[PDB]
């Protein structure tokens, strides 16, 4: 409605403005690299390390950006009470540079991980399924504000 839009415009949303700041694009890569080295430090075979890296990163990103609705602090009357953090990025404007960069990352991650478990069809299928079903679908332009049961 009107009041709702005026409330959503009256203040910059501190819950979703930190993305466009100095060093988030880099921190994503950094945490990916750190997870890789941690699983390497475990000691198992490379395919297990890489599939664990992919699952851990994808599931963490989904649980943080796509699971919880609202803001962790008072913002307005309600304003953003029925939106996840991914739906608040750049005040509900799709396909901005930040969204493009966050979309590209899982695909390139799968491409790099691909050449280690290519010989096993089970791991390859599971990795592709999880990636394309959790890291590319909720971030699409037609899943926006799509509530189901």
């Amino acid at each position: 409605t009107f009041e709702d839009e005026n409330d959503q415009q009256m203040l910059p949303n501190m819950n979703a403005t930190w993305v466009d700041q100095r060093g988030a694009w880099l921190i994503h890569i950094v945490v990916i690299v750190l997870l890789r080295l941690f699983y390497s430090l475990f000691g198992s075979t490379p395919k297990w390390t890489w599939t664990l890296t992919n699952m851990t990163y994808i599931i963490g990103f989904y649980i943080m950006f796509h699971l919880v609705k609202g803001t962790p602090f008072d913002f307005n009357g309600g304003a953003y009470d029925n939106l996840t953090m991914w739906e608040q990025i750049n005040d509900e404007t799709l396909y901005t540079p930040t969204r493009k960069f966050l979309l590209i990352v899982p695909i390139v991650l799968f491409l790099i991980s691909n050449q280690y478990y290519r010989n096993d069809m089970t791991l390859f299928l599971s990795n592709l399924a999880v990636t394309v079903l959790i890291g590319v679908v909720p971030k699409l332009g037609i899943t926006h504000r799509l509530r189901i049961s």
């Binding site: 590209i104 695909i107 799968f110 491409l111 691909n114 290519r118 592709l128």
Partner: peptide
């Protein structure tokens, strides 16, 4: 079949 998947992913990226 790997090459087809990789090419499809590249096309999706673009």
């Amino acid at each position: 079949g790997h090459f087809f998947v990789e090419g499809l992913l590249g096309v999706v990226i673009i």
